[PDB]
């Protein structure tokens with residue numbers, strides 16, 4: 001394998017961390033290959049679930065808790081801290097909230113959250129590498145509670161960053177928020193990618209094509225599929241009661257990705273930087289409810 005940039009994996013990984021048996025598990029937690037029986041039963045299906053009142057309540061609670069856990073991660077972003085230490089703190093923060101960390105053993109994923117530094121687009125595996133000043137780093141959190149998953153991500157600055165970092169992170173955030181702004185019943189899911197790409201393209205950046213936003217509730221990933229690039233052919237129309245994510249991955253250079261021999265880590269083919277943001281949204285009559293918003297602060301961590 002020829003690495004696309006300077007980043008390398010830092011092994012060995014610590015033994016996987018157990019989740020105490022009192023915390024409710026998703027079906028895949030104990031499947032040997034980490035397969036989700038309830039997801040695979042609905043594979044290849046465009047049909048979007050419409051959430052009941054108790055579904056909505058369950059989605060509200062878990063996305064609130066997921067935010068709390070991301071805020072925990074954010075507080076630890078500094079030079080010399082390893083992504084593995086972030087993951088350990090994340091893992092304990094999920095347990096304290098009586099939640100299962102959804103990434104853990106998801107299709108055998110080894111860790112409790114995804115940490116994506118610089119050229120890693122998404123799905124970075126927490127490891128022994130100390131964060132370096134100048135780095136940007138995305139932490140993507142999902143929690144599982146009483147049957148429901150809640151999912152969000154933010155990109156952070158590691159100490160002081162160069163001007164290109166500031167710009168890429170800002171634009172990425174702007175892309176997310178412009179797409180959230182257009183969410184309301186009757187809007188086509190395929191339109192969000194037109195908005196995202198138009199904004200990224202205007203700022204000299206490209207949009208990753210191989211990963212998408214997703215529906216989420218009792219399933220971690222399900223219908224709808226939500227591309228972040230223009231002229232995509234996404235199937236579906238937004239409706240009051242739909243719950244899904246927008247999670248645009250935006251690149252300094254070109255849009256193309258490939259995966260490390262670990263089966264998970266997705267990196268730019270040119271080794272330039274990528275940034276990402278994610279909220280889980282609920283479609284309402286006025287627009288959408290941002291289930292994963294910060295409740296006690298106006299902005300994402302990179303601003304404050």
Ligand SMILES: Cc1nc(-c2ccc(Cl)cn2)nc(NC[C@H](NCCCCc2ccccc2)c2ccccc2)c1Cl
Nearest residue numbers: 039040043044103106109114123211212213214221222
């Ligand atoms: C954004 C995103 N993230 C993930 C993801 C998975 C694991 C971790 Cl640790 C972090 N993120 N998985 C995703 N999708 C997984 C997905 N699975 C959803 C359920 C389908 C069940 C199924 C049936 C047969 C073969 C594969 C999958 C899928 C599988 C194959 C092609 C596209 C998407 C997505 Cl969209």
Ligand SMILES: [Co+2]
Nearest residue numbers: 114122123140
């Ligand atoms: Co993912």
Ligand SMILES: [Co+2]
Nearest residue numbers: 140151152278
């Ligand atoms: Co996520």
Ligand SMILES: [Co+2]
Nearest residue numbers: 151245247278
């Ligand atoms: Co997601």
Ligand SMILES: [K+]
Nearest residue numbers: 116117118274
């Ligand atoms: K990154």
